[PDB]
Write a protein that binds this ligand. Sequence first.
Ligand SMILES: *[C@@H]1O[C@H](CO[C@@H]2O[C@@H](C)[C@@H](O)[C@@H](O)[C@@H]2O)[C@@H](O[C@@H]2O[C@H](CO)[C@@H](O[C@@H]3O[C@H](CO)[C@@H](O[C@H]4O[C@H](CO)[C@@H](O)[C@H](O)[C@@H]4O)[C@H](O[C@H]4O[C@H](CO)[C@@H](O)[C@H](O)[C@@H]4O)[C@@H]3O)[C@H](O)[C@H]2NC(C)=O)[C@H](O)[C@H]1NC(C)=O
Ligand SMILES: *[C@@H]1O[C@H](CO[C@@H]2O[C@@H](C)[C@@H](O)[C@@H](O)[C@@H]2O)[C@@H](O[C@@H]2O[C@H](CO)[C@@H](O[C@@H]3O[C@H](CO)[C@@H](O[C@H]4O[C@H](CO)[C@@H](O)[C@H](O)[C@@H]4O)[C@H](O[C@H]4O[C@H](CO)[C@@H](O)[C@H](O)[C@@H]4O)[C@@H]3O)[C@H](O)[C@H]2NC(C)=O)[C@H](O)[C@H]1NC(C)=O
Ligand code: PIO
Ligand code: PIO
Ligand code: PLC
Ligand code: PLC
Ligand code: CLR
Ligand code: CLR
Ligand code: CLR
Ligand code: CLR
Lengths: 517, 517, 40, 40
Amino acid sequence: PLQQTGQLFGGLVRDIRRRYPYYLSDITDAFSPQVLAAVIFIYFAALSPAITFGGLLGEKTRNQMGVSELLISTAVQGILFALLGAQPLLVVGFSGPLLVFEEAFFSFCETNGLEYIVGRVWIGFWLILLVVLVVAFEGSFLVRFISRYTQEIFSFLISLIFIYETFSKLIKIFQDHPLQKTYNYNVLMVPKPQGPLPNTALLSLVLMAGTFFFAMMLRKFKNSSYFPGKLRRVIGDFGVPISILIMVLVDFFIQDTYTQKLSVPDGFKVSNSSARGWVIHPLGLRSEFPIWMMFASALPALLVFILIFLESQITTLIVSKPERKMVKGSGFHLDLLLVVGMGGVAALFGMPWLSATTVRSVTHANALTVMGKAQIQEVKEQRISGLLVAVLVGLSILMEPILSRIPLAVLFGIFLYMGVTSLSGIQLFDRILLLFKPPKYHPDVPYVKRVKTWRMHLFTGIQIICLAVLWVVKSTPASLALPFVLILTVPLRRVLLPLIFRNVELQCLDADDAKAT
Amino acid sequence: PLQQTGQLFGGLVRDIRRRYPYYLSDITDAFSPQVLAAVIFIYFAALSPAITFGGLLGEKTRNQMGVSELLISTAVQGILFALLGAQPLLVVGFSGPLLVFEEAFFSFCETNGLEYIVGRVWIGFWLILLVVLVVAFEGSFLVRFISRYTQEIFSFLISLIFIYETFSKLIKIFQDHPLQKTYNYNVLMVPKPQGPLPNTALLSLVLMAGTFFFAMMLRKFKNSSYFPGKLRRVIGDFGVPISILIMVLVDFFIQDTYTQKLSVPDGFKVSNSSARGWVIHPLGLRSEFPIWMMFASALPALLVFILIFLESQITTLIVSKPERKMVKGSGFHLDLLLVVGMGGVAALFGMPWLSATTVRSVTHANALTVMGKAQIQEVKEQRISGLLVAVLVGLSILMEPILSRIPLAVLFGIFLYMGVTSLSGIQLFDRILLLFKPPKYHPDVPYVKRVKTWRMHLFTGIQIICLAVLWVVKSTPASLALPFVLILTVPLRRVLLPLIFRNVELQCLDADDAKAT
Amino acid sequence: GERVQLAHHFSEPEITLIIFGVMAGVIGTILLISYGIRRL
Amino acid sequence: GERVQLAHHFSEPEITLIIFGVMAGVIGTILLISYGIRRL
Ligand SMILES: *[C@@H]1O[C@H](CO[C@@H]2O[C@@H](C)[C@@H](O)[C@@H](O)[C@@H]2O)[C@@H](O[C@@H]2O[C@H](CO)[C@@H](O[C@@H]3O[C@H](CO)[C@@H](O[C@H]4O[C@H](CO)[C@@H](O)[C@H](O)[C@@H]4O)[C@H](O[C@H]4O[C@H](CO)[C@@H](O)[C@H](O)[C@@H]4O)[C@@H]3O)[C@H](O)[C@H]2NC(C)=O)[C@H](O)[C@H]1NC(C)=O
Ligand SMILES: *[C@@H]1O[C@H](CO[C@@H]2O[C@@H](C)[C@@H](O)[C@@H](O)[C@@H]2O)[C@@H](O[C@@H]2O[C@H](CO)[C@@H](O[C@@H]3O[C@H](CO)[C@@H](O[C@H]4O[C@H](CO)[C@@H](O)[C@H](O)[C@@H]4O)[C@H](O[C@H]4O[C@H](CO)[C@@H](O)[C@H](O)[C@@H]4O)[C@@H]3O)[C@H](O)[C@H]2NC(C)=O)[C@H](O)[C@H]1NC(C)=O
Ligand SMILES: CCCCCCCC(=O)OC[C@H](COP(=O)(O)O[C@@H]1[C@H](O)[C@H](O)[C@@H](OP(=O)(O)O)[C@H](OP(=O)(O)O)[C@H]1O)OC(=O)CCCCCCC
Ligand SMILES: CCCCCCCC(=O)OC[C@H](COP(=O)(O)O[C@@H]1[C@H](O)[C@H](O)[C@@H](OP(=O)(O)O)[C@H](OP(=O)(O)O)[C@H]1O)OC(=O)CCCCCCC
Ligand SMILES: CCCCCCCCCCCC(=O)OC[C@H](COP(=O)(O)OCC[N+](C)(C)C)OC(=O)CCCCCCCCCCC
Ligand SMILES: CCCCCCCCCCCC(=O)OC[C@H](COP(=O)(O)OCC[N+](C)(C)C)OC(=O)CCCCCCCCCCC
Ligand SMILES: CC(C)CCC[C@@H](C)[C@H]1CC[C@H]2[C@@H]3CC=C4C[C@@H](O)CC[C@]4(C)[C@H]3CC[C@]12C
Ligand SMILES: CC(C)CCC[C@@H](C)[C@H]1CC[C@H]2[C@@H]3CC=C4C[C@@H](O)CC[C@]4(C)[C@H]3CC[C@]12C
Ligand SMILES: CC(C)CCC[C@@H](C)[C@H]1CC[C@H]2[C@@H]3CC=C4C[C@@H](O)CC[C@]4(C)[C@H]3CC[C@]12C
Ligand SMILES: CC(C)CCC[C@@H](C)[C@H]1CC[C@H]2[C@@H]3CC=C4C[C@@H](O)CC[C@]4(C)[C@H]3CC[C@]12C
């Protein structure tokens, strides 16, 4: 799929030829209880970031883009991608880098007296042009130069960031409601608690820990010799939903203590009816949009394109690894065209452009993974689960009576579960564990049996330095430069590592399919 | 050791001959870090019941016997038993049945206008006579008729009761400090919190869960391939102490929230200086002690003797099982003589008589168990750990500045750890788990491979009915009848089970050493 | 739109259609240039 | 002891010694009886 035909739009055409013949199976393969459990799990995995990022976006953009816009964009783009994409297991949504870019662009527009939403429209117009050219010339074939080295550095960094943010949210809860001898028992509740409340921080900690514990136990149970096999697998398949239900009921039957709940917008309305409508005029809403910015919008478009392209294509690489038993193929050209083009169109309606998100997509693929008797046996590859998730996100505004009873701390436990389980297939994480194991215990794998232990540890340590550098860049104002710093690992693997590692060592340590050279 | 010589005091003499030759090794075998870790662990395992039961005793006896008396009795009897007993891994202390008997005897003495402490003196005098006669005629040899059937029913029941009480204490904390919207921020603290406090119940839950989690993780780590082997084993050996220290520090650095702490008596003084001194006059303190009660004290002495005898001798059977790799022998006659005689003497000083306690002793033996490469390899059989535990209990009144900083909830986590780990070697618990497993997964053991699955489950179910009956008897006023109901399992195994099970089935299901008949 | 919106000569459909037509023109230009190159 | 205690003819050591002597007598009686039995 990463080959270059030399024919215009060839990679795109091949993508359609490869996957669309399976379209009927992409529907009938969804008829299973594992697929419904995955739907319920990924629904929360996708809804919570949408609500949280939409709130942050509204706060940081004066509600020019907010929760409702992000919810509708997620729903519509997810529906379209599930129906038309070549890899329907990707989950399309908002991400932290996109939030950072929206912040930076809003600040720039404020400095220069620009309408931020109109500037976004012009970025979107440039995005559509860029993706059409990249897809026309098969630019997606360059993804073949992103080896397991870069894939795993990126995946491990994203997983660690996910876990770190999950824990930071709990720390914030403790910061808002510290442990004190005395509280103001009469504290204003609306819009949010205006002062510290008793039991809230500890109860949130308990709910998070309990959800995580129940999820991890249910996952252990699905593997185990207990109960009849078919019952154990269905209960194990519905592990995250069962844990969520248990902890939600626990919180429900505790009436007196306050816990923060999920909050969706009142209806399907723009976040700021005073600022903009549903359709944004490219020439301006209140003031005429300057002509120079119509051309200068290409550069922010380049940066947005790079962010989306790298996140989405590395995610596609990870979820489509041969060891994951995906036997339907993915379309790098088609998926990029869909994601970026839908984002460019979404800009016209004041809505976020999106990217295929690594943790959500890996969680979705793992929830559809059926395990052999240890060894992955197959994946329920189909379009229904993603489509249903997108529809549920779209309908979330109507199911407020249900969502208002779900504490965020329960979802914190689920987020921790996602973050820990996303590390499984990463050879970098496996090798990091080997740093704390005596050599005799290192498993029988080619990078153990064909590479000296200290050489393998040196290889891991160089990768760890890359993670440290990337995490440092993430924690600075120049965090939008992260894709370029990540790109620098490709020259590192191809130019510098062979200077210190023999060829056979690199075939063992950076293997496209975990082969012994 | 359970043979009958026919010679007066023969079993006692054999016990001394068997174990006292190892006396030097019973000192030098203590030179190891595993033995110090066991000391620290069993110190809390023994101190907390002493404090809690002593408080209950003082409340229920008007402080005629209280915390200080129980602490000193535990210390002195433990020191003597460790120096002189044939099984120094037994832990001698107070138990729930003994508390129940003290309640009943105090009530009886109140009804008839008797001095309770003097009546205890006369019970003790009768106890000394009874044990001398039983030991003189080798009565301890009857313990040979208590097979794994009864041993495991008793052990499982005691473990379940231990876990149940541990959880009931946490429930009580929640009952005293419920989750409420508002609290009286000015609440009297001395002697104890006089009203609900915020964060206390949830923080106690968190401390218990955290201690339990850290202990269980450290136990998993000692087994694991991580770290150098010698470091992993020492860290694993000090698992309970490390968990206690971590959670104690966590609670320490939370200044504002209240947690109940360990409280020892101010000094080495009687609990009620107005009621009695250190020595109790057998003829009466205030009123002349009636003559008829001097004779009638034999019957309560019989009941106390039965309680202590059964608890202590079944505990000795359990800790001395051949599969536990004890290669030094135990003395059933000597240990009974010591425990009961020291109890009878302790009565003269207004102090509790004690029994070798099952959960504490099994915990102590397990902490001294060294694991092969899965398979138990040996046990650090020695007198130093028990002696040091007894000394620390005796010195607890002087180390209040340390004990006052230890929350009870941390010890609740440790108690849960003890309760769960005490179930390991019990075949009844293993078979209960098999009720929830498909037959193909049942392990290759004789009671699986030589008994039909449904027959094995019928055998387990009959045992479960015995546990239900015993637990029901425990929860009624006639809970002092528990030893007799337990004795009824010996006829059940020897008279009724052979009517429904073939001989080979019983050799497989009730094996003295887990043999295939 | 929302509130008071400055009136343009081109409406939103008209201006977006014009922008998409210019984009199509540019794309076709670059594609035809690519077709011409690599052949001479 | 503690507070005001009834005065007895026998002190605590004396009475406990007497009780232990009676106990020793009874134990010796039963032991000698057992020695006599099982032999005739
Ligand atoms: C929905 O959006 C409302 C306004 O949207 C407006 O129109 C859309 C199409 C976009 O172009 C938006 O960028 C635009 O604001 C929100 O009402 C606004 O609320 C904020 C919060 O108070 C205020 O907006 C503006 O903030 C500027 C800060 O960057 C401020 O500049 C002033 O700042 C310095 C110090 O920071 C002052 O010392 C200076 O005086 C400087 O002017 C703006 O100041 C003036 O802006 C306009 C210019 O025409 C004046 O008419 C205002 O009276 C104001 O004096 C201004 O404060 C305003 O309160 C308000 N702005 C407008 C234009 O209504 C609304 O909050 C939002 N809804 C939600 C839920 O977020
Ligand atoms: C230390 O011990 C003190 C007393 O110890 C006494 O001497 C030792 C050697 C033992 O023999 C003890 O059994 C003995 O009590 C404690 O002081 C006592 O506190 C309790 C709690 O208030 C009270 O003790 C007695 O409780 C009886 C209840 O069973 C009560 O009987 C009365 O009960 C009914 C209703 O329940 C009433 O309606 C009747 O009137 C009935 O009499 C006792 O009543 C009388 O007892 C003596 C008899 O001589 C009188 O002199 C008393 O004045 C009282 O009226 C009695 O209340 C007493 O307060 C008190 N008793 C004594 C004798 O001092 C002390 O609390 C304890 N310390 C700690 C820390 O626990
Ligand atoms: C909830 C069940 C209702 C209980 C009511 C009581 C009635 C009841 O439910 O049990 C009868 C029935 C016996 O059937 P059976 O043992 O043959 O069933 C096997 C079991 O399902 C295993 O899971 C299998 O392998 P795997 O796991 O797929 O890999 C195996 O398949 P395979 O070897 O051919 O490939 C199955 O044959 O159930 C049980 O499985 C025993 C465990 C019951 C444990 C008791 C339930 C805790
Ligand atoms: C804090 C410790 C300081 C580490 C200093 C950092 C430097 C450092 O310590 O590594 C070199 C040294 C190598 O020693 P080495 O591998 O030969 O040591 C083996 C190790 O102790 C295993 O535990 C052994 O089996 P087991 O467990 O007894 O059954 C084996 O015994 P056996 O086969 O002969 O029977 C031992 O030989 O350490 C390690 O052990 C490797 C794991 C280091 C992991 C370090 C992660 C902390
Ligand atoms: C899966 C389970 C996850 C396990 C991890 C638990 C992390 C919990 C974070 C607690 C620290 C925190 O949040 O600290 C932050 C807070 C407050 O800080 P401040 O300096 O007052 O803030 C300054 C700014 N103000 C003024 C706005 C607040 O601390 C506290 O009030 C201390 C109480 C901590 C309770 C410890 C909980 C139990 C931890 C151990 C459980 C095993
Ligand atoms: C290893 C970790 C152990 C896990 C087990 C946790 C058990 C905790 C016991 C809670 C119930 C209780 O204690 O309930 C008892 C109390 C009060 O009851 P009441 O009717 O007001 O009493 C009547 C008498 N009064 C008036 C004197 C009080 O309930 C509550 O205030 C409800 C709050 C419960 C919080 C739930 C904690 C989280 C549980 C799930 C964690 C996975
Ligand atoms: C750095 C931290 C995280 C890990 C500490 C342990 C690492 C560095 C240790 C564990 C086992 C060690 C190896 C054990 C034995 C030898 C053989 C010797 O001829 C070359 C070095 C080599 C191969 C060691 C290199 C260092 C090593 C890999
Ligand atoms: C009672 C609850 C706790 C457990 C439920 C499962 C138990 C009762 C089930 C699991 C497997 C079952 C066995 C499976 C197959 C057979 C073979 C048949 O020829 C006799 C009964 C027998 C041997 C069954 C008896 C009941 C059984 C032991
Ligand atoms: C890649 C995307 C942005 C399309 C190409 C950008 C440039 C070449 C094109 C796209 C549409 C064009 C605009 C369309 C409409 C008008 C109205 C006219 O009265 C002034 C020029 C102006 C404002 C044009 C300027 C140039 C323009 C911005
Ligand atoms: C098994 C133990 C209790 C010893 C045997 C009990 C009986 C036989 C003995 C033990 C010591 C005896 C008591 C010792 C002292 C005296 C004082 C005397 O002026 C009256 C009788 C009296 C009070 C005795 C009665 C009988 C007695 C209670």
